[PDB]
Design an enzyme around this catalytic site. Sequence first.
Site, short mmCIF file in Angstrom:
data_model
loop_
_atom_site.label_atom_id
_atom_site.label_comp_id
_atom_site.label_asym_id
_atom_site.label_seq_id
_atom_site.Cartn_x
_atom_site.Cartn_y
_atom_site.Cartn_z
N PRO A 1 0.61 -1.21 -0.02
CA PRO A 1 -0.01 0.03 -0.19
C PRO A 1 0.79 1.25 0.01
CG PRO A 1 -0.88 -1.45 1.76
CD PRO A 1 0.56 -2.23 1.26
N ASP A 2 0.64 2.11 -0.84
CA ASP A 2 1.34 3.43 -1.08
C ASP A 2 0.76 4.10 0.09
OD1 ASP A 2 1.62 2.39 -3.97
OD2 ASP A 2 3.21 3.62 -3.84
N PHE A 3 2.02 4.45 1.03
CA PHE A 3 1.53 5.05 2.31
C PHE A 3 1.40 6.76 2.02
CE2 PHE A 3 2.62 7.10 6.42
CZ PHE A 3 1.75 6.49 7.35
N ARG A 4 2.08 7.31 1.14
CA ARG A 4 2.06 8.65 0.85
C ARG A 4 1.29 9.15 -0.48
NH1 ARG A 4 8.32 9.44 0.32
NH2 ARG A 4 7.90 7.73 -0.84
N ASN B 1 12.08 5.87 -1.64
CA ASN B 1 11.08 5.07 -1.28
C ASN B 1 11.32 4.67 0.28
OD1 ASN B 1 10.26 4.71 -3.96
ND2 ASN B 1 10.92 2.73 -4.15
N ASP C 1 9.74 2.05 1.72
CA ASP C 1 9.01 0.87 2.08
C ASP C 1 9.89 -0.13 2.60
OD1 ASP C 1 10.45 -0.11 -0.18
OD2 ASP C 1 8.71 0.61 -1.56
N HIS D 1 14.37 9.96 1.28
CA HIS D 1 13.12 10.22 2.17
C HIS D 1 12.86 9.85 3.53
CE1 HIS D 1 10.97 11.80 -1.79
NE2 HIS D 1 12.29 12.34 -1.48
N1 LIG Z 1 2.32 0.91 3.23
C1 LIG Z 1 3.59 0.91 3.94
S1 LIG Z 1 5.21 1.46 2.93
C2 LIG Z 1 3.90 0.64 5.46
C3 LIG Z 1 2.80 1.03 6.26
C4 LIG Z 1 2.92 0.80 7.76
C5 LIG Z 1 4.14 0.41 8.14
O1 LIG Z 1 4.21 0.32 9.41
C6 LIG Z 1 5.67 -0.32 9.81
C7 LIG Z 1 5.92 0.14 11.09
F1 LIG Z 1 5.12 -0.62 12.08
F2 LIG Z 1 7.30 0.05 11.66
F3 LIG Z 1 5.26 1.49 11.56
N2 LIG Z 1 5.35 0.18 7.51
C8 LIG Z 1 4.84 0.38 5.87
#
Ligand code: A1IBX
Length: 286
Positions: free
Chosen positions: A39-42, A105, A107, A124
């Site tokens: 999922p694209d977080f930004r 990225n 991710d 970033h």
């Molecule tokens: N959709 C992406 S990129 C995403 C969303 C949540 C997440 O949570 C990681 C942590 F638990 F460390 F906060 N990591 C990546």
Amino acid sequence: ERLLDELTLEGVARYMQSERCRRVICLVGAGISTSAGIPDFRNLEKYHLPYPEAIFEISYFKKHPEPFFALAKELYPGQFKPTICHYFMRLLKDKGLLLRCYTQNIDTLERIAGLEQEDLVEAHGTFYTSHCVSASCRHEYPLSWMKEKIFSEVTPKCEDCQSLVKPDIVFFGESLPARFFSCMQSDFLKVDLLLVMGTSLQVQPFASLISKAPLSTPRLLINKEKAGQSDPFLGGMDFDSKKAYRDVAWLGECDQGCLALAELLGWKKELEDLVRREHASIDAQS
Ligand SMILES: NC(=S)c1ccc(OCC(F)(F)F)nc1
Ligand SMILES: [Cl-]
Ligand SMILES: [Zn+2]
């Protein structure tokens, strides 16, 4: 005159395997991870933000962290599985050709694929590590700890001082990592090839990186769309003028571009074996 014997992927591969090409810088963006299905977080209307960007602003986050962590729970990926592109960069590292990977990225997939801290400029930031926000503490926490807090819908607090713990993403109101500038100043004196993969080179100062290359350094773009050319409106990419001499565009899915280049290099079996093994390992995590 020019280092590439032709402005094609074949020309780039021949150059790569020549003695003239020893140091490769990768610049990568979201296109190298779309095949990973993260999922694209930004949606945010329910958090009553004073401005939309507040959810990614450091002062707001310290005031009201709950919207950010609710969004992080919602968009947590089902798996962190790097793509063929990520493992192609691991192969570059293994072949002794990788000077640096600059990534836009957050991710974490560069790290999962085996690029080490010294190989990376996470321009970033990253979700992979998090830190207590108190300047006098800065206790570091790994991904598993934060995931436990996030899916519990417990706001992560530092065990040492009880301040908020923030993932190491660069928020609004924060500056880019100093490592970005120090590495830029040194790496671009040394680079023989720029591999620009899965970025449209639209966000600054990351885009400006391509103009830091020496004039002779070939630049290969692997991207769904042509990008990085000078803007008719606003050192850009010149793929197509009759003055073009060093910039090559391969247009398609980044995975397929990396596969095609690996095939030209004689690396396809190595790359397939690496990807299959690492994917199997990730799929088998028990
Ligand atoms: N959709 C992406 S990129 C995403 C969303 C949540 C997440 O949570 C990681 C942590 F638990 F460390 F906060 N990591 C990546
Ligand atoms: Cl971009
Ligand atoms: Zn702390």
